[PDB]
């Protein structure tokens, strides 16, 4: 069973655009998206499709790059750190749901390294 995907809009929450957020979409996300190991992370985990009936029994704060992309496109975030936290939640979810050495974990590990490389330096405000 699948819960609703994470919100990509919220009228109670203030919107913002910054140079760093623009960069997170244009450069960081859109480059990671093209990586050979990006595909498991491009949409919310579908526990019915993927036959992971316990996915959402284990993962209580799901996150994926499809959601992050939409949030960035919608100016959902206040700042870059908020967006960066979503990427980190996505990676840690993978390490939590699986186990060390798994192919899926090797994929997340490679993506996380590339992610860190790209956010090491962000544009100035
Ligand atoms: O995301 C997908 C498919 C996305 C999509 C890709 C393009 C077209 C068809 C489906 N599969 C998938 C399978 C699987 N199960 S798997 O055995 O096929 C697998 C093992 C190593 C990589 S995927 C897991 C996960 C997963 C994402 S986060 C997490 O912790 N797990 C994802």
UniProtKB/Swiss-Prot annotation:
Q: In what tissue types does this protein appear?
A: Ubiquitously expressed.
Marked site positions, Acetylated histone binding: 98
Post-translational modification (record)? Phosphorylation by CK2 disrupt the intramolecular binding between the bromo domain 2 and the NPS region and promotes binding between the NPS and the BID regions, leading to activate the protein and promote binding to acetylated histones. In absence of phosphorylation, BRD4 does not localize to p53/TP53 target gene promoters, phosphorylation promoting recruitment to p53/TP53 target promoters.
At the top level of its lineage, which domain of life is listed?
Eukaryota
Linked residues for Glycyl lysine isopeptide (Lys-Gly) (interchain with G-Cter in SUMO2): 57
Q: What is the effect of changing residue 98 to A?
A: Abolishes binding to acetylated histones
Where would I find the Bromo domain in this sequence? 16-122
Tell where it localizes.
Nucleus; Chromosome
Protein family: Belongs to the BET family.
Q: What does the record's miscellaneous section state?
A: JQ1, a thieno-triazolo-1,4-diazepine derivative, and I-BET, a benzodiazepine derivative, have been tested on tumors with success. Treatment with GSK1210151A (I-BET151, a I-BET derivative) has strong effets on mixed lineage leukemia and promotes myeloid differentiation and leukemia stem-cell depletion.
The disease this record links to the protein is:
Cornelia de Lange syndrome 6: A form of Cornelia de Lange syndrome, a clinically heterogeneous developmental disorder associated with malformations affecting multiple systems. It is characterized by facial dysmorphisms, abnormal hands and feet, growth delay, cognitive retardation, hirsutism, gastroesophageal dysfunction and cardiac, ophthalmologic and genitourinary anomalies. CDLS6 inheritance is autosomal dominant. A chromosomal aberration involving BRD4 is found in a rare, aggressive, and lethal carcinoma arising in midline organs of young people. Translocation t(15;19)(q14;p13) with NUTM1 which produces a BRD4-NUTM1 fusion protein.
Tell me, what does this protein do in biology? Chromatin reader protein that recognizes and binds acetylated histones and plays a key role in transmission of epigenetic memory across cell divisions and transcription regulation. Remains associated with acetylated chromatin throughout the entire cell cycle and provides epigenetic memory for postmitotic G1 gene transcription by preserving acetylated chromatin status and maintaining high-order chromatin structure. During interphase, plays a key role in regulating the transcription of signal-inducible genes by associating with the P-TEFb complex and recruiting it to promoters.
The domain-related comment in the record is:
The NET domain mediates interaction with a number of chromatin proteins involved in transcription regulation (NSD3, JMJD6, CHD4, GLTSCR1 and ATAD5). The C-terminal (CTD) region mediates interaction and recruitment of CDK9 and CCNT1 subunits of the P-TEFb complex. It is also required for maintenance of higher-order chromatin structure.
What does the annotation say about its assembly with partners? Answer: Interacts with p53/TP53; the interaction is direct. Interacts (via CTD region) with CDK9 and CCNT1, acting as an associated component of P-TEFb complex. Interacts with RELA (when acetylated at 'Lys-310'). Interacts (via NET domain) with NSD3, CHD4, BICRA and ATAD5. The interaction with BICRA bridges BRD4 to the GBAF complex. Interacts (via NET domain) with JMJD6 (via JmjC and N-terminal domains); the interaction is stronger in presence of ssRNA and recruits JMJD6 on distal enhancers. Interacts with NSD3. Interacts with NIPBL. (Microbial infection) Interacts with bovine papillomavirus type 1 regulatory protein E2. This interactions may serve for the tethering of viral genomes to host mitotic chromosomes allowing successful partitioning of the viral genome during cell division.
Protein name per Swiss-Prot or TrEMBL: Bromodomain-containing protein 4
Species source reads Homo sapiens
